[PDB]
Amino acid sequence: QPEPDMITIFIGTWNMGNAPPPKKITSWFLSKGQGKTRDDSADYIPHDIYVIGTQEDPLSEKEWLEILKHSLQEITSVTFKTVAIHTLWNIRIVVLAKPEHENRISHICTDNVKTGIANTLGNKGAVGVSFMFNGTSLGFVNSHLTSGSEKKLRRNQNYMNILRFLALGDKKLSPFNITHRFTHLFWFGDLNYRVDLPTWEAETIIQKIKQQQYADLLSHDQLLTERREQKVFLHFEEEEITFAPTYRFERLTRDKYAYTKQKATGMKYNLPSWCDRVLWKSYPLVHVVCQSYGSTSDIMTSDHSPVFATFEAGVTSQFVSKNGPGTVDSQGQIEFLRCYATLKTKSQTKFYLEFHSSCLESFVKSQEGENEEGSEGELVVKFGETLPKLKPIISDPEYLLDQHILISIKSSDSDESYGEGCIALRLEATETQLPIYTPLTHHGELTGHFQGEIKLQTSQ
Numbered sequence: 001q002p003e004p005d006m007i008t009i010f011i012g013t014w015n016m017g018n019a020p021p022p023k024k025i026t027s028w029f030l031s032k033g034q035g036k037t038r039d040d041s042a043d044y045i046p047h048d049i050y051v052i053g054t055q056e057d058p059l060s061e062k063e064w065l066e067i068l069k070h071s072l073q074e075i076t077s078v079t080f081k082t083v084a085i086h087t088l089w090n091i092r093i094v095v096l097a098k099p100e101h102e103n104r105i106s107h108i109c110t111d112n113v114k115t116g117i118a119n120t121l122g123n124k125g126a127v128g129v130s131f132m133f134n135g136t137s138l139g140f141v142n143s144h145l146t147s148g149s150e151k152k153l154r155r156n157q158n159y160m161n162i163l164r165f166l167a168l169g170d171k172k173l174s175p176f177n178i179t180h181r182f183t184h185l186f187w188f189g190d191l192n193y194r195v196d197l198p199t200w201e202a203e204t205i206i207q208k209i210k211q212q213q214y215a216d217l218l219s220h221d222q223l224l225t226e227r228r229e230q231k232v233f234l235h236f237e238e239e240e241i242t243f244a245p246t247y248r249f250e251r252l253t254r255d256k257y258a259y260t261k262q263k264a265t266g267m268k269y270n271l272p273s274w275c276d277r278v279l280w281k282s283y284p285l286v287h288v289v290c291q292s293y294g295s296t297s298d299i300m301t302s303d304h305s306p307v308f309a310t311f312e313a314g315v316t317s318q319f320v321s322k323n324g325p326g327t328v329d330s331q332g333q334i335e336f337l338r339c340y341a342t343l344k345t346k347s348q349t350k351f352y353l354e355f356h357s358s359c360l361e362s363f364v365k366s367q368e369g370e371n372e373e374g375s376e377g378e379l380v381v382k383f384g385e386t387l388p389k390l391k392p393i394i395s396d397p398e399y400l401l402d403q404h405i406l407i408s409i410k411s412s413d414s415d416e417s418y419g420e421g422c423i424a425l426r427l428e429a430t431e432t433q434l435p436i437y438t439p440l441t442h443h444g445e446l447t448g449h450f451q452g453e454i455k456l457q458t459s460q
């Protein structure tokens with residue numbers, strides 16, 4: 001039975017509004033309703049991995065697992081295995097996989113982060129799961145961010161707190177946060193970003209939704225505008241939104257948006273909004289294609305409609321050769337020529353690089369680079385031809401061209417990362433000097449750039 005080179009992943013996000021679900025929720029797992037929907041001809045084909053994010057979930061883990069498994073079994077006739085379940089207050093993540101994948105999945109991690117302080121600490125935050133699927137690392141974050149049209153800044157802070165403090169994936173990747181630890185990272189939930197239009201425009205917005213004219217609404221979506229201005233979710237992707245706003249509905253119909261201020265809303269307006277989102281970030285030049293992104297029309301127990309997204313995702317095998325793992329393959333090397341980092345920092349310390357990759361036995365520390373002043377005020381750290389020669393565990397091009405090198409630039413004074421990035425080894429040529437580039441981030445904010453050239457030697 002050959003190892004897969006592609007899998008499909010279902011991502012669900014549903015704010016349940018503290019109400020039990022209806023008896024049938026199969027439309028969610030089938031990607032049927034509004035937006036980019038799945039072909040009917042695929043209905044009996046199970047996804048490889050289902051990741052279900054809930055918010056305001058009133059169920060026990062047992063009660064929700066029974067509904068999820070029985071739903072998938074009705075759809076597929078397959079009995080799914082439970083990879084992971086983790087709940088923080090009423091925020092929950094469930095990971096289910098086809099039974100044929102049980103012995104491909106390992107290194108399962110779960111964590112949560114609580115956002116806010118005192119007042120603002122007690123029901124918002126994120127849960128997460130990570131694991132290895134053969135040679136591929138997968139991360140999944142379900143977050144319920146701060147609510148309210150006038151708190152987009154708070155939501156952006158919640159995002160930075162979750163990505164700093166959620167402890168998933170390989171702990172040896174110590175300079176790297178979750179936005180660098182995974183081949184494929186999916187981040188979803190009730191992100192709670194609103195359509196920022198005057199309250200007096202509510203009926204106009206509803207009109208536009210009834211005509212399926214979303215362009216003038218999406219141009220005011222806070223998640224899209226904040227992302228455009230690099231305030232949040234830097235270097236994440238989101239599929240085009242072609243479904244109606246998923247919030248705020250009158251329960252038991254989809255015919256009405258309930259937007260008016262009420263004692264129950266803290267006298268806040270809830271203009272129709274795309275609260276419920278799925279984004280992703282994959283390593284450079286790894287195959288990832290969104291095949292659905294939409295909302296259900298027939299699940300109406302909550303004031304939110306469920307959102308679905310499906311993805312084709314490139315995966316690699318657990319490679320063994322006669323040499324590595326457990327030794328180097330002298331027929332492999334990675335050389336870095338004419339490299340320099342450009343940093344936004346106003347500081348003056350020396351810097352060195354760390355190179356981390358599953359293709360190395362352990363991470364590699366460089367010598368300090370040479371600081372120069374850039375024309376426009378910047379710090380330029382020159383490495384020239386001084387960077388160590390990296391010694392992969394396996395030289396086979398079938399393995400090595402599928403790998404990635406994570407780079408941290410660290411202060412000699414403090415050993416703190418100033419910037420993290422990622423370089424793909426999916427090169428146009430081997431034994432050839434080729435340009436490489438990554439942006440550098442720290443706490444998921446832009447801190448600079450790393451560029452230069454690479455020369456990759458494989459056994460071929």
Ligand SMILES: NC(=O)N1CCN(c2ccc(F)cc2)CC1
Binds near residue numbers: 096097101106107108
């Ligand atoms: N490395 C480990 O800790 N395990 C134990 C759990 N296990 C597993 C269970 C369910 C599933 F759906 C997929 C994988 C894999 C082996």
Ligand SMILES: NC(=O)N1CCN(c2ccc(F)cc2)CC1
Binds near residue numbers: 225227228229
């Ligand atoms: N060249 C790139 O790396 N991107 C990614 C981000 N993207 C974008 C689009 C709309 C929006 F509202 C916010 C961000 C533009 C294309």
